[PDB]
Design an enzyme around this catalytic site. Structure first.
Site, short mmCIF file in Angstrom:
data_model
loop_
_atom_site.label_atom_id
_atom_site.label_comp_id
_atom_site.label_asym_id
_atom_site.label_seq_id
_atom_site.Cartn_x
_atom_site.Cartn_y
_atom_site.Cartn_z
CG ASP D 49 -17.00 26.20 -16.21
OD1 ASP D 49 -18.04 25.68 -15.54
OD2 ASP D 49 -16.61 24.61 -16.98
CB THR D 82 -15.59 22.87 -14.18
OG1 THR D 82 -14.93 21.91 -15.60
CG2 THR D 82 -14.32 23.52 -14.46
CB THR D 83 -17.14 27.09 -11.92
OG1 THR D 83 -17.04 28.61 -10.75
CG2 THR D 83 -17.94 26.76 -11.74
#
Lengths: 73, 512, 102, 517, 510, 285
Positions: D49, D82-83
């Site tokens: 992420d 997230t990423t």
């Protein structure tokens, strides 16, 4: 802490592991041609190997590929 | 033995003056580009004001270091005008730097400054408008608007209109300050924006669960509040020590004795009366068992400020010793309640025996609208509490400057000469202030300023830029509302900050 | 304070017996000369214990040598215990001195 | 005490997000090549992420600093996506200087981006299903833990964890009324078992203390006794001298041991739960002399554990062995002695249906890497459902919304106009970066690949289908079953412009001589 | 030199060129530092402390110069200030101006003694017509406006703006309270700044103003036997033990208990030594204080050496560290010793005021000390500009009106005298316009305008300039007739002292 | 420290033990091939190809080489003398070597069992020296000349002598010096002094009881120590005590004349006790 991004790393991860996969294959084989082992810790203190596992030990190498390929072999 | 005289030193003055001015420039405006300032300890500073970041910045210019006082002198008195005056005396120091070179260099500099502000501060105070409890407003609708007004710029939702009336009443309750430190907005996880809350005393954001925590009383129609600078735990009073074992009673021994002194610490305050034992520090495993077995409420890790703000609202006292405490270094409410709003178990401290403190409970638990509303509410305070302080109120965004800068250049033709420019440029110095907010409101200030100049000329009531609307208009009518005195203050602060320094190209500096 | 004294006390205590060994050790050498000198010319006598045993020459010298040796070893016994008892005093001194004082 | 100017600083700021978002851009999804870390302390590791890497990687710059800062709330709640904002907010970041390069206020650009999220929000709002239910959401969490257990530790979804993911979050979710807390659900690996040793744990799991197995191994009641007090003569996990001054005291000790054993066997049993967690360490000798008596005796307990399992039970602890009540004992829905792995000791699993104020689901591993690679799956798969029960809302992701949410916004542009259309335009494009960037990290030509669902976006609207995230020859998000919590996407949406909105905050780019210092 | 030899940093260029310029730059600083001005000069201390003053010695003291040229003379302005208030800011610039005429004479090639004496000659001639320049004298040193008329000047001679109420409040400080008959006291008249209120709010409390907190109960009696002590309570306990807390445990409970009645002992022995107030250069001791509250001994928790100084000074006090039951040596002086709140701070007050022991201590309220300091600078001078210790000061025109008066006079004589002596005597009466040029700047005009009219006003002993618009075009103020006047005295000194060095400083080529 | 230069300091060093001859010359042989190498490497011949050609060819070489050499009688010490002496006089050192050649070949001929004369390792052969003496005071010796001796009452000449090893302390363990003492006071020392004295005599006794006519005591550091008075008590046992001797010489006396290590009284055994037909020290020449 420090990003190592694709290509320049992929060189480094290669070029070391490239260098790694050679002096082992150099030595590898019955006519596989030996590599002088070098202990920089003790002078040059030497063997001359057909074994790459010895190669890793004597001269310490840093490549993530290596460290992987170290564990692999 | 160091110094320099000469206009180069004088230019050296303005050299710093414009640069530090550029900092604050829109810093109190909503936008800009921010530099978080991490300090060699690793201490980050984003501060909305330049001042705190100015508190960081060394000033190699005593000249520019004076404004550090003056901007703070305008900061400490109000909290605003810090940016503004920083944009003014420099703007002054901007203006005359040629005029000096143009020959204004003699003290007709500082001789002319005084009447300039003297002109204004009267014309200033006159145009401002005063209100009553029955007059234009409940006296709440003033604050209501002035809270709505401050809840305007960041648009959030329209409950800013409803939040307006919220903050007003604790503002009414204390108003021992222009500042909000004794009320404060507590961002409260859970709930909605639409349901927000205002405590009649302190309250604690989050207190934490322990053994039998739902057991420990969350409800007192009165506590005795132990404000603890210190904690209690098995690491505070050892749960761990060895012994040489012969009878296994020896095993039973070192365990039993240690267990006591933890309970000694708290029972002495438990028997000093405290039903609410507030440790701003955690409570550990064996100690809270006692709190749990005592069946008297304790709280670990509760905000020290809220703990201090408690002895404001609750008239309590911080207890640095846990041992053999007493009821006066305790604290009181006529309600201790505790409940978990959203995920935060939230102490309710009110019916306090006094109030130096209310607090505002902002719900929705949401990062976005709330942080803006807060930043909006804080200035509502800066308005609504000062609006209480000064009912005579004036309007920003060039609701004055044009007329002022008009009124001045109006009197320029009488002067003409060096200080005529001090009639014109001191006039000029005004409209860069809103010129920032046209950047902030996304406008061209010039033609904004232009017409509003004409529209204080051909106009002349409040016509001026409004960043809240992102428009221009009569701003007092736009309800851009701040008391007059804060003007005169910044005025006096700005006009005085410069005149001193322009009188100095001569600055002595000695290591000895 | 009393804690400081015992360590000083036992110090010179076990110091006392360790010294006189050397004079014994000295005379242990003095008799070796004579146990090298005697062939048993006149009746050789160890005395250890309230009995006076019949003693023979050849067993006497290795004895007194051991006696020399055994004693010679006993310079080390307390020289260990020296610093032992010496140290524990000093440690408590500044404490117990100031403790005596206040 | 040197000071960058505005755009300059932002031009200096824009130098940050590029590479750090780039790291994501070939790391996006499984077709994204995940992230590796090495240490000054000499540890080479794989990262994921933003948060994992960007926390493990260290962040020089306020931009880079805010990354982890901006990052947290994302992976906290949803755990998935997230990423994403890294690329996204970084893309919009590079859209910002761009419009400044196009001579548009930093002010204004961040303005029309905000509600540009809304026209993406309302756009996202429509996408896919704003609904799921227990037997339903089983299957998407199957799918979610398909792509979760198939993208990380193993590329084989192992339905155990895939179901272990669904149940205990529900267990805290159905406890909390379609609310759940990622704190309460917990993912606990312990190696020596397998990644195919995977456990749904709604209670606490601890190795059952045997100072002897043969002296009977057993679990008793369903309930646990949590003790700061001894269930057998106590000792604080520290050395306790066992000597006896005479040959006779040798005889009385083991009796004393057993006299208090049976007495603490007596007085904790009468308290309740013969299995009793004694916070205290104790000799392996007498601990198994109580074992020899009875009742495997839990000793050498972590000080946290007793209170940890205490609060989880909602019950208290016995501080003092003379004080005895079952509330000061713990609450196990089921105490169960459970062999931990084939390799090593039985544990005592306390599964709490009494009260679980913490739920720590369990897994094992053949390696600590893979077991944490697995927890990496587990946490965030437990994170989606976390919100995804609080709202059951899901939107087929992977660029299908990116290719789509851009539709509303970039079409909203000339609906907007003045500065907002730009802040609609240079906004929405940042969305289609990722399907581009996902086609990027794939073997795929993104603009080409992007062009495809584009035609679809002209053909169809808000495809539940889409482009292959798995790099499947077929392109859906349906056939791919790539769908994310319609929270999390918008939860993710909330993040990106905020950062740009953060980088602008005040007018002060100055530094005292302290900026990052 | 040419050689390796000797020691000099003056001579050749330096004597002629560089010393004069070393005799220049700071005079150049002092030009609008003296007289009516809006000039302001920032200064940082060894404290690095940012401050502004048009006073020299403040600036001077921190100035180092390889030459004695700038160096040596400043003592004169001090030698001046030793005598009086300002005019000191005039002293040096008078020299420096008239000096650099000589380097011109050096260009013109005039001999030292030839350059030297005509000034000295005319330095008399100044002092000779200087009494002819007495346009008034000082009537009532008790009167405020008698005195305020003056005091405004050195303040003006410092700074233009604040001069008036200062000149008022300083006589409202009652420089009156001394005969100033030859008896005048600036130890009994002290400027004590309260940080707080305003400077228009600044008061003058006759009797010692100590802003230091009046500690506990006030004085035993108002004729205060005063114990002034550098360290009267350092603590009576020493805790060093086995642990320096407890080893034998009860040995602790002795001294923390046995300490305080030794502070009682000392405090009782403050009551026993008889001090109606005890004074701590060191800390207060609370139990002691409590005992001193029992014994009702007035106390000062902490005392500046400055405090202790004036304390030791005027009381007859001696500040001492005492670990012992104290001994009165300090005893009393002041016959009323009070607590005041001015700027609402506890003011330890000591007043015996006898008209001779008479204490009128200026108490400055203000929200800034730098404020009250550059104030106190001019306030430093006004009192001691008031301090002539001639009740009749033969008041001469303030502000520099007397300058042009003798510009005509002595250069008209300088005309009459022959030889190379001429320009010596001629440059002399030319030394005036410097400040009429200097303040003319801050006034905003050229000096020709000034001086031509300052010449064309001819003999006035009134018409003059400063920082004013009257100082601009008219080249006319009343630097007599308006109430701005000067004592005859410092004139003689401001004249003479600088003339000496300007002569002397050149003669040394070493 | 160059490694191929290390090979060289490796190389002849072997030739030292390989022969002691042609060691300089095995430096001379190596480069010559290596001279021919870069040629073949300028030709590019492969290191395996280069290699396998050569040691092979050496075989091929040694063969033709072998017949060049002349087989000479290795049973005949004179032919051994002659050849070696002719060698010696075809070679560097004839000064003492040829004078020592009747010594050299003889101890050899001694350790020569076969007419083949095998390899004749130098192992049983013990080089010894004596300060001064003479080249005529040089001699071969049929049994081990040993360093000094320990006799207090000890036997000087002992014959058919079972040679004891001691790997154990005879003094009793060293406590505060060599022996067993515990005292802060003389009552303490006088009581326990009974213990140490008597047993060290017993441990001494058993040694002679174990049939040691000679005793090899390796160094008192290779020992705990021997108290010379109990050793005087042991020298009273009329064993021939050689103390403080090298573990090497122990091993030499172990391997060569067969006195094997004795670390214990029980560990005294005839295998571990060499037999000295005459062991007597000599002061002379």
């Amino acid at each position: 802490a420090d990003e190592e991004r694709a290509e320049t790393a992929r060189l480094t991860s290669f070029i070391g592991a490239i260098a790694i996969g050679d002096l082992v294959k150099s030595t590898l084989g019955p006519k596989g041609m030996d590599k002088i082992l070098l202990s920089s810790g003790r002078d040059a203190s030497l063997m001359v190997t057909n074994d790459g596992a010895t190669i890793l030990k004597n001269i310490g190498v840093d490549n993530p590929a290596a460290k992987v390929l170290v564990d692999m072999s | 033995t160091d110094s320099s005289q000469g206009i180069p030193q004088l230019v050296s003055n303005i050299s710093a003056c414009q640069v530090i001015a550029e900092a604050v420039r829109t810093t109190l405006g909503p936008r800009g580009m921010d530099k978080l300032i991490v300090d060699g300890r690793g201490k980050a500073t984003i501060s909305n004001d330049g001042a705190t970041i100015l508190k960081l910045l060394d000033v190699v210019h005593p000249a520019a270091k004076t404004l550090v006082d003056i901007a703070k002198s305008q900061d400490a008195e109000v909290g605003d005008g810090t940016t503004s005056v920083t944009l003014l005396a420099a703007e002054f120091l901007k203006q005359v730097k040629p005029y000096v070179e143009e020959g204004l260099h003699p003290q007709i500099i500082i001789r002319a400054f005084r009447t300039a502000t003297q002109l204004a501060v009267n014309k200033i105070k006159e145009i401002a408008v005063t209100v009553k409890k029955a007059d234009k407003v409940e006296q709440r609708k003033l604050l209501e608007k002035c809270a709505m007004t401050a809840l305007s710029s960041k648009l959030i939702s329209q409950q800013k209109a409803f939040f307006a009336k919220m903050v007003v009443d604790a503002v009414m309750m204390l108003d021992d300050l222009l500042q909000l430190k004794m009320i404060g907005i507590k961002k409260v996880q859970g709930g909605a924006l639409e349901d927000s809350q205002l405590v009649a005393g302190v309250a604690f954001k989050k207190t934490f669960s322990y053994a039998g925590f739902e057991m420990q009383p969350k409800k007192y129609h009165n506590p005795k509040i132990a404000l603890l600078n210190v904690e209690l735990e098995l690491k505070a009073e050892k749960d761990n020590a060895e012994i040489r074992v012969h009878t296994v009673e020896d095993y039973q021994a070192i365990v039993d004795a240690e267990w006591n002194i933890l309970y000694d610490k708290l029972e002495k305050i438990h028997h000093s009366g405290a039903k609410v034992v507030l440790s701003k520090l955690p409570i550990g495993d064996v100690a809270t068992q006692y709190f749990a077995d005592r069946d008297m409420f304790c709280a670990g890790r509760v905000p020290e400020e809220d703990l201090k703000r408690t002895m404001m609202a609750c008239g309590g006292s911080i207890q640095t010793s846990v041992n053999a405490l007493s009821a006066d270094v305790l604290g009181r409410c006529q309600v201790f309640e505790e409940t978990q709003i959203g995920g935060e178990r939230y102490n309710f401290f009110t019916g306090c025996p006094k109030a130096k403190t209310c607090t505002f409970i902002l719900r929705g638990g949401a990062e976005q609208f709330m942080e803006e509303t807060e930043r909006s509410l804080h200035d509502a305070i800066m308005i609504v509490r000062r609006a209480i302080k000064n009912d005579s109120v004036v309007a920003g965004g060039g609701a004055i400057e044009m007329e002022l800068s008009k009124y001045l250049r109006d009197y320029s033709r009488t002067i003409p000469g060096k200080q005529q420019l001090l009639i014109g440029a001191y006039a000029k110095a005004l409209e860069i202030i809103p010129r920032q907010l046209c950047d902030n409101a996304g406008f061209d200030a010039t033609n904004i300023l232009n017409k509003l100049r004409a529209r204080h000329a051909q106009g002349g009531t409040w016509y001026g830029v409004d960043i809240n609307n992102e428009d221009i208009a009569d701003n007092f009518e736009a309800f851009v509302w701040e008391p007059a005195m804060v003007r005169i203050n910044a005025l006096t602060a700005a006009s005085e900050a410069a005149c001193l320094i322009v009188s100095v190209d001569e600055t002595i500096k000695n290591p000895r | 304070v009393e804690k400081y004294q015992q360590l000083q006390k036992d110090l010179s205590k076990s110091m006392s017996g360790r010294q006189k060994l050397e004079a014994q050790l000295t005379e242990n050498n003095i008799v070796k000369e004579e146990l090298a000198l005697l062939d048993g010319s006149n009746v050789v006598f160890k005395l250890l214990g309230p009995v006076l045993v019949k003693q023979e020459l050849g067993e006497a010298r290795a004895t007194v040598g051991k006696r020399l040796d055994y004693i010679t070893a006993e310079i080390k016994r307390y020289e260990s215990q020296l610093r032992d008892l010496e140290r524990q005093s000093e440690q408590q001194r500044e404490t117990l001195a100031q403790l005596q004082q206040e | 005490k040197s000071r960058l100017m505005g755009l300059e600083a932002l031009k200096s700021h824009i130098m940050a997000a590029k590479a750090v978002a780039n790291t994501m851009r070939t790391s996006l999804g499984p077709n994204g090549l995940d992230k590796m870390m090495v240490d000054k302390d000499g540890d080479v590791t794989v990262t994921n992420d933003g948060a994992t890497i960007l926390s493990m990687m260290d962040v020089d710059h306020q931009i880079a600093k805010l990354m982890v800062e901006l990052s947290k709330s994302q992976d906290d709640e949803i755990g998935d996506g997230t990423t994403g904002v890294v690329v996204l907010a970084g893309a919009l970041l590079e859209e910002a200087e761009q419009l400044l390069d196009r001579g548009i206020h930093p002010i204004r650009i961040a303005d029309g981006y905000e509600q540009a999220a809304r026209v993406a929000i309302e756009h996202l709002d429509k996408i896919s299903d704003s609904v799921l239910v227990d037997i339903k959401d089983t299957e998407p969490l199957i799918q979610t833990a398909k792509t979760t257990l198939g993208s990380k530790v193993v590329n084989s979804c192992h339905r155990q964890m895939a179901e272990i993911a669904v149940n205990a979050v529900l267990t805290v979710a159905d406890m909390e009324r379609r609310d759940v807390d990622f704190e309460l659900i917990k993912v606990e690996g312990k190696v020596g078992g397998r990644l195919e040793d995977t456990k749904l744990i709604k209670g606490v799991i601890v190795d059952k203390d045997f100072s002897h197995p043969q002296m009977p191994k057993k679990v008793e009641d369903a309930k646990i006794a949590i003790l700061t007090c001894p269930f057998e003569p106590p000792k604080p996990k520290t050395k306790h001298k066992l000597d006896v001054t005479s040959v006779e005291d040798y005889k009385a000790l083991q009796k004393y041991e057993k006299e208090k054993f049976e007495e603490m066997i007596q007085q904790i049993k009468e308290t309740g739960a013969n299995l009793a967690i004694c916070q205290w360490g104790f000799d392996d000798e007498a601990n198994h002399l109580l074992l020899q008596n009875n009742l495997p005796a839990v000793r050498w307990v972590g000080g946290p554990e007793i209170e940890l399992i205490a609060i989880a039970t909602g019950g208290r602890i016995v501080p003092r062995f003379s004080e005895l009540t079952a509330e000061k004992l713990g609450f196990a829905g089921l105490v169960q002695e459970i062999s931990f792995g084939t390799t090593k000791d039985k544990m005592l699993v306390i599964e709490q249906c009494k009260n679980s104020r913490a739920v720590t689901i369990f897994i094992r591993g053949g390696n600590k890497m893979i077991i944490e690679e697995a927890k990496r799956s587990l946490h965030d798969a437990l994170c989606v459902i976390r919100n995804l029960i609080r709202d059951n809302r899901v939107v087929y992701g992977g660029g299908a919304a990116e290719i789509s949410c851009a539709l509303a916004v970039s079409q909203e542009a000339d609906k907007c106009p003045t500065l907002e259309q730009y802040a609609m335009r240079a906004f929405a494009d940042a969305l289609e970066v990722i399907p581009m960037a996902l086609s990027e990290n794939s073997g795929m030509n993104p603009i080409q690949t992007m062009t495809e669902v584009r035609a679809r976006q002209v053909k169809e609207m808000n495809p539940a289908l889409g482009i292959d995230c798995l790099h499947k020859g077929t392109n859906d998000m349906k056939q791919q079953h790539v769908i994310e919590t319609l929270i999390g996407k918008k939860q993710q949406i909330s993040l990106a412009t905020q950062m740009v909105r953060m980088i602008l905050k005040i007018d002060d780019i100055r530094k005292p001589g302290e900026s990052e210092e | 030199m040419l050689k390796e030899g000797a020691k000099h940093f003056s001579g050749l260029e330096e004597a002629v060129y560089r010393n004069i310029q070393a005799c220049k730059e700071l005079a150049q600083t002092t030009r609008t530092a003296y007289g009516p001005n809006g000039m302001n000069k920032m200064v940082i201390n060894h404290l690095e402390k940012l401050f502004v003053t048009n006073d020299a010695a403040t600036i001077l003291r921190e100035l180092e110069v390889q030459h004695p040229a700038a160096k040596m003379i400043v003592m004169a302005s001090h030698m001046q200030e030793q005598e009086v208030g300002d005019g000191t800011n005039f002293v040096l610039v008078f020299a420096g101006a008239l000096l650099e005429l000589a380097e011109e004479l050096l260009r013109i090639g005039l001999s030292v003694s030839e350059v030297i004496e005509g000034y000295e000659i005319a330095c008399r001639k100044a002092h000779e017509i200087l009494p002819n320049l007495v346009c008034c004298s000082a009537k009532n040193l008790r009167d405020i406006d008698e005195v305020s008329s003056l005091l405004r000047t050195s303040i003006m001679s410092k700074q233009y703006g604040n001069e008036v109420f200062l000149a008022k409040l300083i006589a409202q400080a009652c420089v009156s309270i001394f005969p100033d008959s030859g008896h005048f006291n600036v130890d009994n008249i002290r400027v004590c700044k309260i940080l707080g209120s305003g400077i228009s709010s600044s008061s003058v409390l006759h009797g010692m103003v100590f802003k230091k907190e009046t500690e506990g109960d006030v004085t035993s009696v108002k004729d205060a036997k005063i114990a002034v002590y550098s360290c009267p309570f350092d603590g009576m306990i020493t805790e060093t033990k086995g642990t320096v807390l407890i080893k034998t445990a009860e040995e602790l409970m002795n001294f923390s208990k046995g300490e305080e009645n030794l502070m009682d002992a000392q405090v009782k022995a403050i009551a026993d030594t008889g001090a109606n107030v005890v004074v701590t250069g060191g800390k207060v001791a609370d139990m002691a204080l409590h005992y001193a509250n029992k014994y009702n001994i007035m106390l000062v928790r902490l005392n500046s050496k400055w405090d202790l100084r004036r304390l030791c000074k005027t009381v007859g006090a001696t500040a001492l560290p005492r670990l012992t039951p104290p001994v009165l040596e300090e005893m009393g002086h002041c016959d009323s010793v009070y607590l005041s709140e001015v700027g609402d701070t506890q003011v330890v007050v000591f007043k015996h005021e006898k008209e001779d022991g008479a204490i009128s201590t200026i108490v400055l309220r203000g929200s800034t000390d730098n404020l009250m300091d550059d104030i106190e600078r001019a306030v430093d001078d006004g009192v001691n500009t008031f301090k002539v210790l001639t009740r009749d000061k033969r008041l001469v025109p303030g502000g520099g009106a007397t300058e042009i008066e003798l510009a005509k006079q002595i250069t008209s004589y300088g005309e009459t005298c022959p030889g190379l002596e001429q320009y010596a005597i001629k440059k002399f009466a030319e030394a005036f316009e410097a400040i009429p040029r200097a303040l003319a700047e801050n006034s905003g005009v050229k000096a020709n305008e000034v001086i031509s009219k300052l010449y064309a006003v001819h003999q006035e002993g009134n018409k003059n300039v400063g920082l004013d618009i009257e100082a601009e075009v008219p080249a006319v103020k009343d630097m007599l007739e308006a109430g701005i006047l000067d004592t005859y005295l410092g004139k003689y000194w401001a004249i003479k002292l600088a003339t000496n060095a300007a002569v002397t400083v050149l003669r040394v080529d070493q | 420290l160059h490694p191929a230069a290390r090979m060289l300091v490796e190389l002849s060093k072997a030739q030292d033990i390989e022969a002691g001859d042609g060691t300089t010359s095995v430096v001379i042989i190596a480069g010559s091939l290596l001279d021919s190498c870069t040629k073949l490497l300028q030709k590019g011949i492969h290191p395996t190809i280069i290699s396998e050609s050569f040691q092979k060819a050496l075989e091929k070489g040694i063969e033709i080489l072998t017949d060049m050499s002349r087989p000479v009688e290795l049973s005949d010490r004179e032919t051994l003398l002659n050849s070696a002496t002719t060698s010696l006089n075809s070679k560097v050192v004839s000064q003492y070597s040829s004078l020592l050649s009747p010594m050299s070949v003889n101890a050899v001929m001694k350790v020569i069992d076969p007419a083949t004369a095998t390899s004749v390792d130098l192992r049983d052969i013990k080089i010894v020296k004596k300060l001064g003496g003479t080249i005529d005071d040089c001699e071969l010796v049929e049994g081990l000349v040993l360093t000094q001796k320990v006799s207090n009452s000890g036997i000087t000449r002992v014959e058919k002598a079972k040679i004891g090893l001691i790997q154990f302390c005879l003094s009793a363990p060293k406590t505060d010096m060599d022996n067993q003492i515990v005292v802060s006071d003389y009552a303490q020392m006088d009581r326990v002094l009974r213990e140490e004295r008597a047993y060290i005599l017993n441990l001494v006794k058993q040694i002679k009881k174990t049939g040691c006519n000679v005793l090899l005591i390796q160094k008192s550091i290779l020992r705990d120590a021997l108290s010379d008075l109990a050793l005087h008590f042991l020298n009273k046992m009329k064993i021939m005590v050689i103390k403080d001797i090298e573990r090497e010489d122990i091993e030499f006396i172990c391997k060569t004349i067969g006195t094997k290590p004795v670390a214990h009284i029980d560990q005294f055994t005839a295998d571990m006790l060499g037999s000295a037909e005459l062991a007597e020290e000599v002061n002379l020449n």
